[PDB]
Design a protein around this ligand. Sequence first.
Ligand SMILES: Cc1cc(CCCCCCCOc2ccc(C3=N[C@@H](C)CO3)cc2)on1
Lengths: 236, 236, 59, 40, 40, 255, 273
Amino acid sequence: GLPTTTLPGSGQFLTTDDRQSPSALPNYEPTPRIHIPGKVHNLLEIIQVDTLIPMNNTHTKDEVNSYLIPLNANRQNEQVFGTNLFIGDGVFKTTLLGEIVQYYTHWSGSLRFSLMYTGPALSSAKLILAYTPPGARGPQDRREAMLGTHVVWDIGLQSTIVMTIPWTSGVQFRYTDPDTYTSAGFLSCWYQTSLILPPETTGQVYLLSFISACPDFKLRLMKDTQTISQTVALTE
Amino acid sequence: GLPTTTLPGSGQFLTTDDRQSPSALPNYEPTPRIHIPGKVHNLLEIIQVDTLIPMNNTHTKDEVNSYLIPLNANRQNEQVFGTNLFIGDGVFKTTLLGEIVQYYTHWSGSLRFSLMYTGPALSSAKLILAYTPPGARGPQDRREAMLGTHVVWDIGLQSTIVMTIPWTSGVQFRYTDPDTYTSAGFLSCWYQTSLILPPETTGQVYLLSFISACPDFKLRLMKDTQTISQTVALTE
Amino acid sequence: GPALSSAKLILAYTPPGARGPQDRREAMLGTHVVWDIGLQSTIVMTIPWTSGVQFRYTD
Amino acid sequence: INYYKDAASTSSAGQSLSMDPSKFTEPVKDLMLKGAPALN
Amino acid sequence: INYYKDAASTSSAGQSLSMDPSKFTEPVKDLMLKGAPALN
Amino acid sequence: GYSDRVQQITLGNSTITTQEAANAVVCYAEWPEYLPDVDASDVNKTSKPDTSVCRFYTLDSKTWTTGSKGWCWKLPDALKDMGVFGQNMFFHSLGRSGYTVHVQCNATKFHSGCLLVVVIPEHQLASHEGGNVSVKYTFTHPGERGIDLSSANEVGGPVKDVLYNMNGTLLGNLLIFPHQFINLRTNNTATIVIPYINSVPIDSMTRHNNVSLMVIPIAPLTVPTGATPSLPITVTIAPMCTEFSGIRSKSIVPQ
Amino acid sequence: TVASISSGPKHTQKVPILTANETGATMPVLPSDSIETRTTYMHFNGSETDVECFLGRAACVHVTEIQNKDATGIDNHREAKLFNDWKINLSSLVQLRKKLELFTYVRFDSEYTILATASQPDSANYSSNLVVQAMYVPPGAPNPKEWDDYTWQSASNPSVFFKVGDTSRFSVPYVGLASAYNCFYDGYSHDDAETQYGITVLSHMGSMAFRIVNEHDEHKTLVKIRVYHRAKHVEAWIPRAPRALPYTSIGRTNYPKNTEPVIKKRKGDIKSY
Ligand SMILES: Cc1cc(CCCCCCCOc2ccc(C3=N[C@@H](C)CO3)cc2)on1
């Protein structure tokens, strides 16, 4: 008989501990694995695939239309859309990125925001996208917007433009859940010159917008998502 | 199954024991360290920086004035100040040295007591500082004082004088908290000749006094400080 | 001044393009030296050549 | 040290440290180079 | 012997045994030698 | 013939000479340096205006009188309006800087008085209201004026009690912070070099001040007979190794 | 190591005891610079003053309480202490607080011990062993509304189940967002004119929720939770002046008005012993 002493914590059950256990089914042989395409190893692998952002959130019931950012022909100087960058809330929240970020407490890294244009091929347009780093207000006019991170996008044969929100930060991590101290800025978009439709054409054209994370990205300290809950256990 | 026996003490929680525990956050990656000037490793590093002693304790509410030891022009033979050396109490008690000593039960070592003179540059003075080792009473006149550890200080260009209270002791440790058996002596200061002010000048001049520990110093057996307490938990 | 006096002065050079400074705050933003009056009796300020054109007329 | 005989009884697995998003981010048949035109 | 995988789970650290008060006691720009005059 | 006593600091297009110095302190024995990559997080290239921001700005002068309690300035606040340093400050999202602080006060060999000049990293002030009353923004951003510890309590402002350092600690122990004394009989200036000290590699210059400079009379000013009873104290400060990052629109701050 | 070397009479031009404190230095003067000494050794290392040792013992950081009782007809579980919750923080109790605030920035892993004891105030019968569940609810994750919400499923959030009377123990890595935790912060969360000042804004680390898993018996049972915290792997920068006045609030430096003189007045003269 070897002398032992038990410490504080004996008998506790910590849902996060990782130890060995007896197998209830001694000697059982599991089914062989066969090959299946698509294996995922890290959630970091999947948040780099871009998905659509319901940017046009202004509706009243969920609709395919809140994915469409409208553009008006012949407007000059004006603003196309605006949003803050709380990736865990608001427009971002239902996107795959938003949806995964919510399983973690802290995030750090660059984001990739792209816009794909869908107007007739014989039209043309020049837009400016601007990222405003924390510390200033959402820009109120392009002059204000153009003094921060921006890209003049020229609509052409190449249909999409990929803007990166480079990680601009004092503190090396921000909370996913809306924190002030930890806030990331604003994203706005304005006409640089203006949309022009060809003859025989009319109305609004739309941009689709996507979001995905750069390879830069870090997420840490897992927790429970506000995105799902329940009141009684389900049954069959 | 290996046979064991549990000993007395099993299941106890000793706030001072040091063992391993499961991490609640398996696999989490802490923020990188960046460089910050000022790292402290031992409390022994900081108690060697000198800080001011409110020697002039005679006021009735805390004031900047109890840091000032006054000096009178033209007095001869007389006494400037006196104090016992219970570093955990009395004048010493609020100083950084006093304040740290109070986290430990026993101290041993030499102390460094210095006086910086602030009188007009065209004045002059000679003071005697005396350390009286345990066993005799606080000296009552310079004759008595001058027979123990002393330094004649000549006020000059060099503004401060550093007196050391060398460790004089039978027992190799003394309690911080006032013990008799364990007591350390007295410190007194007298005019050696006298302060003399230049013409066109008048009034009192003051000495500032500091205390810090020599590299000699030892503190041991940590405990709780009488210097802080509370009646209900604080809240935000 | 008497040896037992003391003083600290600021001398400022204002390069072409601005007006003669009107208060020290204005003055201190251009070439300047805080002079501390001491044992060393003189202070030598240099007006470094600040110029677009490499020569100026005397007149 | 495993104290038990069966593999199911061992602790959690250890980090894939595999990581290759291209099956998801670039499943295109003809390779696209960043910087070259998307559609030629 | 660590029984656990993560570093946070290990016991207390071990004595710095670093100790250098000069950043606190002598942060002067020009070095002062004990015994030489303070102000020259 | 070099003395600890005479010194010259040239930084940018500005120079300071002191003929009665008492050495100089370099906080925590470290000299200001730029931000190394290994410590970097924000991916933005930073802007280093160099000589246009790293020069000496002299704040407006104070007047030490027998009743003075002490003054307190915060950095980078005190410089929020100095030349291009200030512009850069309001225009970038993040910035970082070290400083050379030179406090000046000359008198004669008949005066007495002694000021403590100390730099406190992260000096979080206390509300004089007690409880958990906060100290409003404006109150902790006095600008070049600094805070005058002998001014009256105001509402939403900090407490100005000197024996407590504006935070519940005793004046006597401020000596654990990099500091230097100005003792009229010895000294006429104090100079402290401050390296950048923070828990993040770069931060916002407007929502967070990283040091308070404090000048406190400790041995009261005593002038010779029939002298005017006061002396001016001047503070000149120079940003050093400044870097700004994340440029944009230009912050708007309360008041 | 020698604590003192042997030194004899001196009659020099080299005076180590005259200095200029105006410089900001504390010159390293020793007994042997001003008296005649004999050799003595240190016999000591300064082991127990290492900051790891100083901050490394468990301190009580929080006492809360929850009760097991019939929730039937309770409109607000949180309010009935059917499950309390604690806004994790480390300055609510002061013994440990004064110790930490001797430093400006501090970095460490935490080891928590949680002791839970039960009390039966109203004369009772048989007490069935209660099992406490302690959840970590970091900020951004659903916070419990009833004592038996879906939240308690805690499928992604670390939770520990232990018995009242026992102790639970686990250790959490340094979860700070920056490189160190700020013991002090002279800033705001943004340049707002009315935003709060202090660290409260930097202290966000979320809260921790406790509940009893057991349904109710016929009597009521009070369970009082004590959380202990031990720093391990400590790193501390920039020493500061110790706290002199009493504390009033978590996260602000504020002291109470009409406080009392903190320096003991002499019973006698400056000259008194
Ligand atoms: C089950 C279960 C429960 C838990 C809790 C996880 C621990 C999270 C707490 C993280 C450490 O919290 C703090 C809070 C404040 C400070 C701090 N404030 C300043 C005065 C200094 O330090 C440090 C750590 O984990 N698993």
